[PDB]
Each structure stands twice: as structure tokens, then as C-alpha cells.
Design a protein around this motif. Structure first.
Motif, PDB file in Angstrom:
ATOM      1  N   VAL A 214      22.210 -50.741   4.048  1.00 29.62           N
ATOM      2  CA  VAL A 214      22.478 -52.101   4.330  1.00 29.62           C
ATOM      3  C   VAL A 214      22.394 -52.919   3.122  1.00 29.62           C
ATOM      4  O   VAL A 214      21.628 -52.933   2.069  1.00 29.62           O
TER       5      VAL A 214
ATOM      6  N   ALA B 271      16.631 -65.997   9.345  1.00 31.50           N
ATOM      7  CA  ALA B 271      16.434 -64.394   9.042  1.00 31.50           C
ATOM      8  C   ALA B 271      16.121 -63.784  10.599  1.00 31.50           C
ATOM      9  O   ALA B 271      16.879 -62.711  10.510  1.00 31.50           O
ATOM     10  N   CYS B 272      15.436 -64.535  11.259  1.00 31.13           N
ATOM     11  CA  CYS B 272      15.154 -63.830  12.580  1.00 31.13           C
ATOM     12  C   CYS B 272      16.540 -63.564  13.498  1.00 31.13           C
ATOM     13  O   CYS B 272      16.895 -62.720  14.032  1.00 31.13           O
TER      14      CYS B 272
ATOM     15  N   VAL C  67      22.368 -57.190   1.598  1.00 29.67           N
ATOM     16  CA  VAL C  67      21.835 -58.274   1.936  1.00 29.67           C
ATOM     17  C   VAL C  67      22.050 -59.215   0.552  1.00 29.67           C
ATOM     18  O   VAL C  67      21.680 -58.914  -0.309  1.00 29.67           O
TER      19      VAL C  67
ATOM     20  N   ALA D  33      19.796 -63.893  12.464  1.00 32.78           N
ATOM     21  CA  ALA D  33      20.777 -62.744  11.647  1.00 32.78           C
ATOM     22  C   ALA D  33      20.457 -61.359  12.195  1.00 32.78           C
ATOM     23  O   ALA D  33      21.194 -60.605  12.320  1.00 32.78           O
ATOM     24  N   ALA D  34      18.843 -61.033  11.998  1.00 33.36           N
ATOM     25  CA  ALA D  34      18.555 -59.818  12.431  1.00 33.36           C
ATOM     26  C   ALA D  34      18.777 -59.310  13.817  1.00 33.36           C
ATOM     27  O   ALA D  34      19.243 -58.249  14.083  1.00 33.36           O
TER      28      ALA D  34
END
Ligand code: ATP
Ligand code: ATP
Ligand code: ATP
Ligand code: ATP
Ligand code: MG
Ligand code: MG
Ligand code: MG
Ligand code: MG
Ligand code: MG
Ligand code: MG
Lengths: 871, 348, 176
Positions: C26, C172-173, C28, C175-176
Motif C-alpha cells: 500500500v 482519513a476515516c 500513501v 478514505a479508508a
């Protein structure tokens, strides 16, 4: 206003792709067609006072009241019958607004099209709209009672067909996830998915719910025995078969605070939850005795429901029985009236909570607490009006899903696994769900197979949970399909041939292939049904079949116009050609209209799939601008500007070039085979068979099959006599050949004529032609035989004789004579046998072409001539 | 096959295998048998509806709720050779298989009327049982009702005594066949054929003593497993899949199991969830079949285990300490570890 | 959690270290304007593109003088998201929300106020949004609400007293 015909459409159709549920009514305006409202005094005020809501209807004017801007300036009852049928449904909650009106046939006959929710309510509203509208053009009003009773019938029709709420919950989520669903003909079951990926549900039971688990869960003695042997906490109690020993039984149990139940299971009847005294035990005993689990210890805590779906916890809710509290110095009857006015309370499932009802049983519950209706409660005192909790009786449900302790989560999952149930409701009694049951002295009271969901999806306190999502995840696990590939083939000519070849190619991969045609329904070469099996009723036989991996379906216009498509969407849509066949039928008079029917297939192809179009056909190629899917093309001429522009942008095309059938994929050319080596094509002499082969090869290619598989399939495919009777059957009879076909529309007469032109043998003659049902196109057809055949004989004085006698033989010879006068035998020689024997009129290695009234006769009169075999 | 087994404390169930690999059975039902399939199979109207919608051949018939309309119902069915049944399901009671006359229909009507599927066409052929286990055919047997034949110029009571002495006949399950018993029902069956106990049968004539076949009533079962046509095999497997049952018995009426049912005009009469096995493992003619092997193969598929690892610790001193450490080590692999000691029983 | 290199490692030269690494599953990547203006993006396309805010920083540098121009630099990320992926936009920011009409990808939104007409119009068409409501950080997926956690129990936010940390957590939440 007379109704002549009604059709119900269920799927993508001619009128709309998205408006799947439509009723098409053919209405004959015997009157009114000549009277555009202004000729019907009072028919404005009468219509609006009867149905005052008809202001929300828009028409060509995009305005509120746009309908009513007209009406007085009429529409000859178009719009009015249409809008009334829609409003009558809207008045009872059947929410529908699409509709259209078009004139057809002779003047005065209209097609009225409107949207429905429920099939019978829809048809009912249509008939009712006509009665209402007719009375108002006779008189100036409509009786109120003749409106109220019709609305009552619509409400019942729309209720009788409703799914229960647990099925609606699962079905709604399935639609969100694009999983197709169907109702089945028995036991209220619903099918989810197609072919080999199908699942079945019934309310809260599914195809994954085992019988041993469900039966154990219904056996209270059995369940308790199995769980206590696993170390799981359950209530302490015994078995007293109505012996007057309860007074002793309590000693093994531990004292008076006990529960007395009927020994059998007959719902919530004869049950006392907290026995405090000897005489109470006796009253309970006398009631328990009415049935053929007694004296349990009474544990002190709240009633909690835990939902487990796949060996994993989904939701927890606390249930409380209907009650009132000491909300000031008011009496119980006053408190009930005060809280029973809460706006969140109402009947059925139209609210969250329901109403509190005082009855003899509420009184019995209140008496045990020391209260009655005229009693005043102390501040903050709570009085219960029911012995047990239930939302349907006026209680409440509180979401406690995030407050449950990790050890309790572990225990609940273990209980479901021990009893063997996938979807389970577990009834737990505890004072605190946030502490371990062993510390709070809690117990598990019951395990319920196939529990309901209202309390978890519509709680009175806390947040709603999506319960259905975990169910569909076990039925259709992540990254697994719910559908099988569908290849839909349409067009005026060549569908059956293309369908059989394409099914043959897929079959070379070893998969189970099902298909439907005008001859029969087949699965892997076994015949399931015979006869004309095109249309949505046959498509459903293949799609519901648990063994089918690939579906190939020929699609006809009759099916689309009469009932819509059976599948909603597909992977490959093939359109072969548009031609002037079947005009005047089904309200389609022109070629431009026929093209709109055929385009239905191209417009239902999924965006990830392909449409296969004929680039040599100007009506078909034009469909490319409506298609949301990718487009592939085929042609009989590589020098086709469409093909060239397309491959230059890296598209895919199939062309016939240099004697080969090949695929153009961007800049690369893939040759599949030679036309002369593919048996369905008569040695490369039948251009229409080559085109059908290109379409099948391209569909197989764009859907992922390898070229070698495609080659194997075309090389071994046959269309022999008695496999495809009446479709190019070419017979070898010593030094002579005979051809039997069954051309229907003019394109098939031309297709055969080109085969004849390419023949390298001796002179040709024809012993057949068109019958009585032809709409004077007989002259043009006679003109096709002309300059194709050397000998042209009219036989068209058949037995059917739908009109008059052998008039078509006379019209056909006029056409023959105009284009090829002097052709041998331009006479009528027979009705049957003395002419289709005229092989004896042909020299060595010449050919007799037969266009019979019936194929069986055409071929049997060849068999009698002692043929050798296939060409 | 070395699969461990245990009896359970409730509902006569048996457990096969340990821990996470366990399966349960109860007679002919198992942990793989779904409830929707089993309930549909018990609903005769439901089963017929589902199968005819799939293109599967079933008997033609109607619904007459004890109205005296049987005389007309036969016209939709096709004529007099019909079957009259109680409308409900209460075992083999009140059933006439071949009604030939109006008054016979009435006698059948009066019996049918005792319960709260009527007037079916009577198709002419033998009664065959087909066993399908996992969407795959296992065995086929032909069933014939108790009977005697014209084995010389002897009477029926003499013929019964002659053949009821056959050494392969006896009580219960201690023999292959059982004894023939004459009762009022044998007489009722014989009267319809034109015979009684003192009647002498013509050479090679056969007289039936029962209306239906069953080994437990003195009939026979013949293995026909290797004589079934490939198309009929395909159809039987499709029937089990359409109704949703893993282990199924299918009742077929046909004159010749070696020809397609569409050519012999045969029909499928019934689908039975959880069928018995005596007729396939102990037939009176033909070879016995190992029916159980295909069942265990679906429960415990090839190369898959029926047991979990067991580590047993003993000795005079140190057992509890060794047991807790060993369980702790296995636990570091992320598996569910269960253990027992002198202090408690633990899982993870 | 192992450090490969230290210092300002934003820009296409660093993105290439991660993308060429044989062990990474992954990636980022924080993306700065200096990298885009000086050499373009290192990856051509991505699965998730998150745009947090546009503000008047770095104006006059790199030939960008106005806020409207700065918005065109930030929109580069939203415009390279693969059609099967998502763009995550701030619905409380008028320059960022407007990027939704350039995006070929699906759009998800986040906000600090549930009563935001963009969010409401979006969830009514079954879109996805992340909002701060009733002390909770939650995800709105059509008609259903998923609560993730309470702001006061998430350590990066100073007991729920730092609104800008809450907004960063919502992005962030989502996108996850
Ligand atoms: N031993 C017990 N101690 C405390 N409460 C109990 C005990 N046994 C039953 N109850 C309560 O009685 C309620 C009534 O359920 P019951 O066990 O009587 O099942 P039932 O007869 O199927 O009725 P219902 O339809 O209400 O579930 C349970 O939900 C539980 O709250
Ligand atoms: N591509 C074609 N173009 C023109 N004529 C064709 C074509 N393919 C076949 N034909 C001719 O038309 C006849 C109809 O053949 P076929 O049965 O395959 O048609 P169909 O489209 O299935 O027709 P139907 O509407 O009867 O189902 C053939 O026997 C042949 O004479
Ligand atoms: N339409 C029919 N035509 C011919 N024989 C039939 C027909 N219907 C039933 N039978 C025969 O009757 C027999 C009796 O079975 P039936 O259908 O009556 O089921 P049942 O009442 O459960 O009885 P059983 O326990 O014997 O199966 C069948 O096995 C079959 O041989
Ligand atoms: N390997 C050993 N040899 C000798 N003594 C030991 C050993 N291991 C432990 N002991 C001693 O013996 C005691 C018994 O310990 P432990 O509880 O582990 O034994 P056990 O075998 O489980 O006994 P029990 O029969 O009571 O179950 C220990 O507390 C220690 O004093
Ligand atoms: Mg209960
Ligand atoms: Mg046609
Ligand atoms: Mg056809
Ligand atoms: Mg039977
Ligand atoms: Mg010891
Ligand atoms: Mg020990």
C-alpha cells in the motif's frame, strides 16, 4: 369508451427502458373522439370537483396545473383517462406518474400507457378511470360513493400482494447491490440470482438453514439439554405432570420466586412469571393444566434480544413492556391518555411504536402491582400494562449493540453454533449486558430460529441497524457473482441459425449451456420443451434452472411488444439486421418504428459489456449512438468507412476478407478459418450464412473465448436436414440437386437468389412461392425469381386459401413476366405433387429450388425421389 | 473409514468427527439438509407446481373438494382410468388406483371424504425408486407388491402356503423378504381381480395380494441400477436440484427404465426427502449397493480431516504445569485451543 | 515504521522510491504544490484522491498569484483519480467542493456540520459522506448511519477541543 385490449409489461420495453412496470390499454373512443371537451359542456368543473387533486399533473406545459390549463380545450380524452388512472392509484398510495397517449389504427383508437405499482391495482384503476371519465361526459358529476368504493378496492388489491416486512428488508438490500430477484410459484419463496448462482429465501429462513438446527431450536427440553451439556447457563427447573406437587417442586428449584408455565407450547398462555405464594402457584397450575418446563427459578433482570447471523453478532436490543409512569399526580387512566397521544405511536407498521390498549388483561396485570385505573401513581413510579415485552403491544426497544461485553459476545456466538442455526435470535435475561453473565447471575432463556427484524431496523431509542447487509454477505460472499452470462440475439432474419452456432461454440468449453429458439428449449443437447419458445416465459425457464452456466436467447419482437424482456440486462447484445417484415402488426407500421423495437436489446447491455452491430446496415449501425455499452462491428466488406474509423481507434471488428473470416483488433489481424471449410456455409456460396457466422464468432470473442475454441466450434457445427428443416436443405439426387427453404419476408428470397447465382452447375428452376397472407408484395417476389431462375413455375394455389383461391399464383406470374418474360413454364402447373416432382424438368446436375407452403411436404416429395444424401 | 462417532443427548442425533470438523446425522437427514427443500418435498401440490414449471413430466389431475363432480372431472383428466385419493395426506388410506367405472369412483369418493390431488390420470407401468445423493445418481430398484402365480393347477390359498415357506422369508429385518399375510385387505384386492382363496389360477397368471409395493408387506425389490438410460439419469438429477434436497428418493412410473420417459409416456409421481435404504442394500434380486459410501463422501470430502489434533499429558507429577505451557505455545499460532486441567476447562 | 530516508521527502523523486520497492503493498503519499509545479506527478493515476482545503498560502511563487490559480494546482489530484476510484472533497470549502464537476471518479464528501445542503443532496442520491454529529465521527451511507467513535476518545484530538484535528480524522476515516 370501449376497452379493446390490455397488455401488462414487466421489463424493458418499447415505451421505456427504465419504466419496467407499465399497462398498455387499447381504448376505442366511439364517442368523444369528435368532441374535444369544449363540445362536452360542464366537463371541466365536473372533473375537477370529483378529483380536486388533478393540479399536480403536468403535460406539454411544464407547470403545476399544466393539465388543467387544458382539459377545457380538450385532448379527445387522451391525457384525461391517462391522468385519472394515475391519480386514482396515487390517492391510495400506489405511487406512479409515467404515462403517454398515442393514436393508432383507424381514427379514434388510442394506446393509453400508464405506470403501475401493483399489477391488479393498476388494471383496476384503468377501468375505473374510464367509468369516471365516461360518466362526466354524459352528466356533470360523479357520485361520491362511486369514488369511495373504488378507492377501497384499490387499497385491498395493493395489500393482498404485499411482501411481509422481513422479506422487504432483504429484497431492498438485494436491489441496492444489483442482485436480481423473482417470486416463485410455491410456498411464498423468493429467488435471488440466476442459474447456478441462485439462492432461495422465505422470510427469515434461507437455503443455508438446516433442518436439524431449526427443529432442535423448537424443542425447549431438547435445547436446554444440549446447552447445559456445553457449559452454557440456563434456568433451573423441573417436570410436574399436573400432579399437585408444586408445593414440593419449589424445594428443588430453590424457593417461591418461580415461573409456572403450561407444559406444552401454545403461545403466551397460562403463564405466571413471578409466583410469590402457594395459592398463586395453584391458580397458575389450573391454567397450566389446560395444555397436555415448569417451576423454573425466576431470575431478576431485563429482557434482551441478541441477533447472530453467520456465527457472528449483528445487533442487541433491550425490550420493555407497555407502561406508564408517575408523571405528576395523575391517575393511570389519565397517564395512558397523556402518553398514548405521542406522535410516534400508531397502527401496524406505519409508526415506530403502537398504541396502548386497556383490556381485561391490562387490568389483571395492574391488579398484581396493587393499582387500578383510578389510582394515582407516586412520583416516578412505573406501572406495567403487559406481562411481556413486544413493540406490537405498545412496548419499546432500545439499541444496546455497542454496550455488550466481549465475553458475552463470545458466549452468544458459541450458543448459535452449538444449536446449529445460521440466523438466530437469542433471549437473554440480565440486569447488566455490559458485565459478564456469570457475575450478574444472568441466564439464556430461549433460542429462536428465523427471528424478526423490526426491533433492530426501527428501534424506538438508539440508532437503526442494517440487518440485511450481513445476510446477503453470507448468501453472496465478497467477490462472487450472482449472475450467469447472457447473450441476447435479435434482428429480422438469421436469429435461430446464429443462436444455435453460438451455443455450440460455448459448449466446446465444457460448460452447461442453455438456450431458447423457435423450435425448442435445450440444455446441453437435451430437449426440455418443444414448439415456439421465444419470449420471456421461456427465458425464465433457463434463468431459473440450477444447472445452467451460460444462457443464449433468441429474442423476437412479439415477446418484446407483448410483455417486455425477461432479464433486465445482459453481457452481449447482438443485432443482425432491420427489414420490412411484420409491418402493420403490433401498432408498428414503419421501418423506423421497427428499428426502435430492435434497439431495445442494444440499450440493455451492461456498460461493461458489448453491443454487436452490423456495419453494412444503416439502421443498425446508427444504434451505436444510443448504446451505453462498448460497440463491436461486423461486415462483409473490409472497405467500410465505419470499420476503418473504428479499428483506427483500437476497436474490434469482424470482417470477411481474402476467403477468411477474421477478427480485427486494432492493428492486428486474427484469422479464424476459411469460409469454404465451415460446413454451415455452402462451400462459401451463401453470403448470408457467412454473415451469421461472423456475428457468432465476434460475440464469442468479445465475451472472452479463445480463437482456438471458436475454430473448433465453427468446424464441427452442422445444419443438416432434420436438424434445421426448411433452412437451406440441399439434397443430392444422382446427377441433380434440390434445395428446400422457407423464405418468409423478401430478404430471404433475395438471400436464396444469391445462393442460386453463385452455383456452378446446370440450369435452375423454381417450383414454389408466396401465399395468401402476403400483402400484395407478391409482384415484387415474382420479380425476384425473374432473372434468377431459368424455369419459373407458379404453384401458388395451395390448400390454406385464406382468401379466395390461387390469386397469388396470378400476381406472382405478373411479377415474373414483367422482369423475365420467356422464362420456361410461366403457367400454373399444379397445387402440389405434379409440380414438386419437377426434377424431371431439369438436365444433369441442374437444380430445383422449392419455396413450399409447408416444409414437410417439400422434403418428403424429395425423399420419394430416392435421394443419396446431403449435397 | 476411521471416523469417530458419538451419540448425543437429544433427539436421537449422532455426531461424526471432532471439534471444528464435526457433522451431525439423524437417520437419513443430515447437517447438509436444508429446511426449505425438506418442507417443499412434503407439500404435494407445491412439489407438482414447481416441477411442471421446470418442464418435468408429472401426472395430470385436479381439485374436487368432495363435490359430487367426479363424473365431470374425469373429462378434463381424459376418461375413466383414474386415481382417486383423499385430498389430504394420511398414509396409504382411502386410495383407489384404477377406477374403471362410475360407481367405483363413488366408493372411492366416500372414502376420500374421510380426510378434510384427486382424479389423476392412471399411467400404466411399474413402480421404480431412484436414489440420488449429492446431485448424483446412486441406485435404482423396481418394486413389486406381494403376489402369487399360476404355478400349476393350485388354488390361491395353496399357492400362498407353497411360496410362503421360502427360506429367504421371515419376520422384521432378519431375512430379505417377509411373509405373506392374508387379511380382509388381501381379499379386497383379490376380489377386484376376479379371484378368491379357493380359485385356481391359469398357468402363469399373476394375482396380487396388495395394492402397493413394500418389502415389509411381502413384496420384492429388483436392482435395475445398470439398466437406466443416460437421459433418464440426467432428468433425475435435475429433479433433486429443482426441489433442493441432497438425499432424495424419487418415485417413477414407467414400463421401461431403459428408454426415455418421453417415449414410454412415464411420469414422476413423488419426491421423498430422507428415504430409507433396505431395498438398495438388501435387494431380493440383483447385487447389493454400498449406499453409505456416497453419503460420507459428501460429509467428509476426499483428503479432508475428521479429527483435530489431540495432545495427551500424563505422569505422577507436573501435568498441570506442562498442560498450561503447551496450550500457551499453540495459542501463539492464532488457533482456538481448548484444554482441561484440575483447576478448570478453558477455551482461548 | 522503519525509516528509509530523512528530510523533506515530498515530490516525485520520493514517490518513486516507494513505488519501485519490491515489498510495498500500500502506498500513501502526501503531495505538495512544489512537486507538481516543478516536475508533475510520479504516478499518473490513483485510487483515492483527497483534497483537504484551499487557502492563500504560497501566493506569488511558481507564477501563481491568485487563489483561483492555486485551486487549479490542487485539482490535479482530483482529476487523476481512476474512474473506478474516489475523490474525497471537503464540503465546507467552496473552492474544493466545486472540483466535483471536473472529477471523472466517484465523489465522497466530508464536513463538520451535518446540515450542509451538499451533504444532504448527496446522501439522498445514495452517496457517501463523513460528518461530525452528536459528539461522534460517523459515516453516512445512503439512509444508514455508521458511528465509528467519539471525538473525545480519539487521542489526536485534544479532548474534542481541536476542530481542525477532527476534520483531518474525518478525511482519513472516509478514505479508508
Ligand atoms: N425463568 C425465567 N425467569 C425470568 N423471566 C423468565 C423466565 N422464563 C421466562 N421468562 C420471561 O418470560 C418471557 C415470555 O417468554 P416465554 O419463555 O414464556 O416464551 P413463549 O411462551 O414463546 O412466549 P413469547 O412469545 O412471549 O416468547 C420471556 O421473554 C422472559 O422474559
Ligand atoms: N442473414 C440473413 N439474411 C437474410 N435472410 C436470411 C439470413 N439468414 C437466413 N436467412 C433466410 O431466412 C430464413 C429464416 O431463417 P431462420 O429460421 O434462421 O430465421 P429467424 O430470424 O429465426 O426467423 P423467425 O422469425 O421465423 O424465427 C432462412 O431459412 C433463410 O432463407
Ligand atoms: N397417477 C398415478 N398413476 C399410476 N400409479 C399411481 C399414480 N399415483 C400414484 N400411483 C401409485 O400409487 C402408489 C401409492 O403412493 P401414493 O402416491 O398413494 O403415496 P402415499 O399416499 O404416501 O403412499 P405410499 O406410502 O405407498 O407411498 C405410488 O407408489 C404409485 O405406484
Ligand atoms: N516434574 C516434577 N517433578 C516433581 N515434582 C514436581 C514436578 N513438577 C511439579 N512438581 C511439584 O509437585 C507439585 C504438583 O504440581 P502440579 O499441580 O503441576 O501437579 P499435578 O501432576 O497436576 O498434580 P495433581 O495430581 O494434583 O493434579 C508442584 O507444586 C511442585 O511442588
Ligand atoms: Mg421469547
Ligand atoms: Mg420474424
Ligand atoms: Mg427463430
Ligand atoms: Mg410413494
Ligand atoms: Mg496425582
Ligand atoms: Mg493436575
Amino acid at each position: 369508451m370501449k376497452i379493446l385490449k390490455t397488455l401488462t409489461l414487466r421489463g424493458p420495453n418499447y415505451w421505456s427502458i427504465r419504466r419496467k412496470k407499465l399497462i398498455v390499454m387499447r381504448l376505442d373512443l366511439e364517442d368523444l373522439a369528435e368532441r374535444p371537451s369544449n363540445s362536452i359542456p360542464g366537463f371541466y368543473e365536473g372533473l375537477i370537483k370529483v378529483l380536486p387533486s388533478l393540479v399536480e399533473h403536468f403535460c406539454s406545459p411544464g407547470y403545476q396545473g399544466g393539465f388543467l390549463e387544458r382539459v377545457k380545450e380538450g385532448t379527445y380524452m387522451g391525457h384525461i383517462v391517462e391522468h385519472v388512472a394515475l391519480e386514482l392509484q396515487e390517492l391510495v398510495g400506489m405511487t406512479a406518474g409515467f404515462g403517454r397517449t398515442r393514436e393508432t389504427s383507424t381514427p379514434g383508437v388510442y394506446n393509453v400507457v400508464y405506470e403501475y405499482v401493483d399489477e391488479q391495482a393498476g388494471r383496476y384503476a384503468g377501468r375505473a378511470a374510464v367509468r369516471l371519465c365516461r360518466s362526466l361526459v354524459d352528466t356533470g358529476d360523479y357520485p361520491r360513493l362511486e369514488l369511495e368504493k373504488d378507492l377501497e378496492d384499490l387499497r385491498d388489491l395493493g395489500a393482498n400482494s404485499a411482501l411481509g416486512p422481513s422479506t422487504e428488508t432483504i429484497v431492498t438490500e438485494a436491489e441496492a447491490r444489483k442482485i436480481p430477484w423473482m417470486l416463485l410459484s410455491a410456498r411464498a419463496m423468493v429467488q435471488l440470482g440466476y442459474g447456478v448462482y441462485q439462492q432461495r429465501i422465505q422470510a427469515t429462513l434461507s437455503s443455508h438453514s438446516g433442518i436439524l438446527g431449526v427443529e432442535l431450536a423448537c424443542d425447549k427440553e431438547g435445547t436446554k439439554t444440549i446447552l447445559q451439556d456445553a457449559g452454557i447457563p440456563v434456568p433451573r427447573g423441573t417436570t410436574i405432570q399436573y400432579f399437585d406437587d408444586l408445593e414440593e417442586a419449589i424445594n428443588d428449584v430453590g424457593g417461591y420466586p418461580v415461573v409456572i408455565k403450561p407444559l406444552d407450547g401454545n403461545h403466551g398462555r397460562g403463564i405466571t412469571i413471578n409466583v410469590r405464594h402457594w395459592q398463586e402457584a395453584i391458580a397458575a397450575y389450573d391454567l397450566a393444566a389446560e395444555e397436555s418446563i415448569i417451576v423454573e427459578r425466576y431470575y431478576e433482570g431485563s429482557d434482551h434480544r441478541v441477533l447472530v447471523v453467520n456465527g457472528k453478532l449483528v445487533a442487541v436490543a433491550e425490550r420493555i413492556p407497555a407502561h406508564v409512569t408517575g408523571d405528576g399526580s395523575s391517575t393511570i387512566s389519565e397517564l395512558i391518555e397523556k402518553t398514548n397521544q405521542d406522535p410516534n405511536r400508531g397502527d401496524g407498521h406505519d409508526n415506530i411504536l403502537t398504541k396502548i390498549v386497556v383490556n381485561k388483561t391490562a387490568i389483571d396485570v395492574m391488579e398484581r402491582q396493587g393499582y387500578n385505573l383510578d389510582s394515582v401513581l407516586p412520583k416516578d413510579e412505573v406501572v406495567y400494562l403487559r406481562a411481556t415485552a413486544n413493540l406490537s403491544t405498545g412496548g419499546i426497544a432500545i439499541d444496546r449493540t455497542d454496550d455488550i461485553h466481549p465475553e458475552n459476545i463470545w458466549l452468544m456466538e458459541r450458543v448459535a453454533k452449538v444449536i446449529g442455526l445460521d440466523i438466530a435470535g437469542i433471549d437473554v435475561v440480565t440486569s447488566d449486558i455490559s458485565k459478564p453473565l456469570r457475575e450478574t447471575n444472568g441466564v439464556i432463556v430461549e433460542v429462536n430460529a428465523a427471528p424478526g427484524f423490526r426491533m433492530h431496523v426501527a428501534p424506538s431509542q438508539g440508532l437503526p441497524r442494517n440487518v440485511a447487509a450481513p445476510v446477503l454477505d453470507m448468501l453472496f460472499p465478497p467477490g462472487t457473482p450472482s449472475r450467469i452470462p447472457i447473450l441476447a440475439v435479435t434482428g429480422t432474419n438469421g436469429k435461430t441459425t446464429t443462436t444455435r452456432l453460438l451455443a455450440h461454440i460455448y459448449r466446446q468449453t465444457g460448460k452447461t449451456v442453455g438456450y431458447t429458439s423457435t423450435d425448442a428449449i435445450y440444455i446441453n443437447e437435451y430437449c426440455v420443451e418443444k414448439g415456439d419458445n421465444t419470449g420471456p416465459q421461456s427465458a425464465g425457464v433457463i434463468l431459473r434452472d440450477p444447472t445452467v452456466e451460460v444462457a443464449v436467447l433468441e429474442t423476437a419482437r412479439g415477446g418484446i411488444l407483448r410483455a417486455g424482456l425477461a432479464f433486465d440486462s445482459c453481457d452481449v447484445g447482438v443485432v443482425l439486421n432491420v427489414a420490412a417484415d411484420h409491418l402493420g402488426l403490433g401498432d408498428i407500421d414503419t421501418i423506423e418504428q421497427m428499428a426502435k423495437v430492435k434497439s431495445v436489446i442494444a440499450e440493455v447491455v451492461d456498460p461493461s459489456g458489448y453491443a454487436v452491430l452490423n456495419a453494412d446496415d444503416p439502421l443498425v449501425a446508427a444504434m451505436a449512438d444510443k448504446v451505453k455499452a462498448k460497440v463491436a462491428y461486423f461486415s462483409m466488406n473490409p472497405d467500410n468507412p465505419i470499420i476503418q474509423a473504428h479499428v483506427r481507434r483500437n476497436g474490434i471488428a469482424a470482417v470477411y476478407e481474402s476467403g477468411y473470416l477474421s477478427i480485427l483488433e486494432g492493428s492486428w489481424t486474427l484469422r479464424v478459418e476459411q469460409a469454404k471449410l465451415i460446413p454451415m456455409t455452402m462451400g462459401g456460396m451463401a453470403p448470408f450464412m457467412i454473415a451469421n457466422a461472423l456475428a457468432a464468432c465476434l460475440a464469442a470473442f468479445v465475451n472472452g473465448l479463445d480463437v482456438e475454441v471458436i475454430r473448433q466450434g465453427v468446424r464441427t457445427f452442422t445444419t443438416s436436414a432434420e436438424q434445421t428443416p426448411g433452412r437451406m436443405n440441399l439434397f443430392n439426387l444422382g446427377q441433380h440437386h434440390a434445395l428446400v427453404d422457407y423464405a418468409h419476408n423478401p430478404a430471404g428470397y433475395r438471400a436464396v437468389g444469391d445462393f442460386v447465382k453463385n452455383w456452378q452447375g446446370q440450369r435452375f428452376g423454381v417450383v414454389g412461392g408466396p401465399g395468401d397472407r402476403r400483402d400484395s408484395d407478391l409482384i415484387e417476389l415474382g420479380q425476384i425469381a425473374a432473372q434468377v431462375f431459368d424455369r419459373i413455375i407458379v404453384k401458388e394455389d395451395d390448400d390454406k386459401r385464406g382468401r379466395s383461391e390461387g390469386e397469388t399464383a396470378d400476381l406472382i406470374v405478373k411479377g415474373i413476366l414483367q422482369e423475365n418474360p420467356g422464362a420456361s413454364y410461366e403457367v400454373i402447373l399444379d397445387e402440389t405433387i405434379a409440380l414438386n416432382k419437377a426434377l424431371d424438368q431439369v438436365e444433369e446436375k441442374g437444380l430445383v429450388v422449392v419455396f413450399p407452403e409447408s416444409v414437410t411436404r417439400a422434403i418428403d416429395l424429395i425423399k420419394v425421389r430416392n435421394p443419396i444424401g446431403e449435397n
